[PDB]
């Protein structure tokens, strides 16, 4: 009941910012660029430092020409519109955004602990309690997003960052979409694709609960439930309706995962009459204090080593290219709304 009123409030806030988006709240020459943290097909994310405040931020840079050239104009306008509109303890905060002649820029709080992917691969697999601590934050986060009619559609350890308190910050709304009923776009990463996406059916927010099942499996095994050397072979396993579990998995974990990795949508946890409460009240989450997780009062199982402001030791090294800004504005028409 306290949940329904919190989410009613959250919907109002989201909708005001959605309707009247933040635009052009800084400029490139207010920041020093320090290091590339990540890359994508139309740009990069860089650690930057605000010259006046000395605060560090993660700055996502998108090349407008490459965005138009790869026909993802809507996808990027949309990514920024959602990010500027949401507010949740496990979502990375957008602080500033702007554009120039060549690029779009989204300046986020810097999450210094790096990607869950790194920690998970280094240690091999997480204990059930450790995996459960992270899983609860994703459950609350999808509860939040779904209540705004958002589907996230790109869950992966690679895009779940670990903050200085060892909690999750979800990054990258690149594939997120406001959807009232069904949508049809084929997007994600092969190992996280829900079967209804693979089969080109119209799908809903339940693809996110399937993806949660893949994440929990992968966090607890150290590898995902469906993998092969060719995507089509992964897709065959996903749609097959069969999953194998490591014998070290608890019986409660196997049960939860059989219910999330349900090919049949009439049977998938998160998609039934009781919604997210089927997941929250599952035995695997018996020991979980949902309010305490939301209030970030639970002690993290792990805190990344943090060697001072702007430490990037938890991040991989990428080639440092020049950020060329043209003397002439490009694609100005297409990105008016940004």
């Amino acid at each position: 009941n306290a949940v329904k009123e919190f989410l009613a409030k959250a919907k109002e806030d989201f909708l005001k910012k959605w309707e009247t988006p933040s635009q052009n709240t800084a400029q490139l020459d207010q920041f020093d660029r320090i290091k590339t943290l990540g890359t994508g097909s139309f740009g990069r994310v860089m650690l930057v430092k605000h010259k006046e405040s000395g605060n560090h931020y993660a700055m996502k840079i998108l090349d407008k020409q490459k965005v138009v050239k790869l026909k993802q104009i809507e996808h990027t306008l949309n990514e920024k519109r959602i990010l500027q509109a949401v507010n949740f303890p496990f979502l990375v905060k957008l602080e500033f955004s702007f554009k120039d002649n060549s690029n779009l820029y989204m300046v986020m709080e810097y999450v210094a602990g790096g990607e869950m992917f790194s920690h998970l691969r280094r240690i091999g697999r997480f204990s059930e309690p450790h995996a459960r601590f992270y899983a609860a934050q994703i459950v609350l986060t999808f509860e939040y997003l779904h209540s705004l009619d958002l589907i996230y559609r790109d869950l992966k350890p690679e895009n779940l960052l670990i903050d200085q308190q060892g909690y999750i910050q979800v990054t990258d709304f690149g594939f997120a979409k406001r959807v009232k009923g069904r949508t049809w776009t084929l997007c994600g990463t092969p190992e996280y694709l829900a079967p209804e996406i693979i089969l080109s059916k119209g799908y809903n927010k339940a693809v996110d609960w399937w993806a949660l099942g893949v994440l929990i499996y992968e966090m607890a095994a150290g590898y995902p439930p469906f993998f092969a050397d060719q995507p089509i072979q992964i897709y065959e396993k996903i749609v097959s309706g069969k999953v194998r579990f490591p014998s070290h998995f608890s019986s409660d974990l196997k049960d939860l995962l059989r219910n999330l990795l349900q090919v049949d949508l009439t049977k998938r946890f998160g998609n039934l009459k009781n919604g997210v409460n089927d997941i929250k009240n599952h035995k695997w989450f018996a020991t979980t204090d949902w309010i305490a997780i939301y209030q970030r009062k639970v002690e993290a199982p792990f805190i990344p080593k943090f060697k001072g402001p702007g430490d990037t030791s938890n991040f991989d090294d990428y080639e440092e290219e020049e950020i060329r800004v043209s003397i002439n504005e490009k694609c100005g028409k297409e990105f008016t709304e940004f």
């Binding site: 996808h75 992917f117 691969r121 992966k156 776009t185 996280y192 590898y223």
Partner: peptide, 12 residues
């Protein structure tokens, strides 16, 4: 043998 390399997300 699972390939543990970081994964690319794509649309269409």
């Amino acid at each position: 043998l699972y390939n543990r390399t970081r994964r690319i997300s794509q649309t269409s």
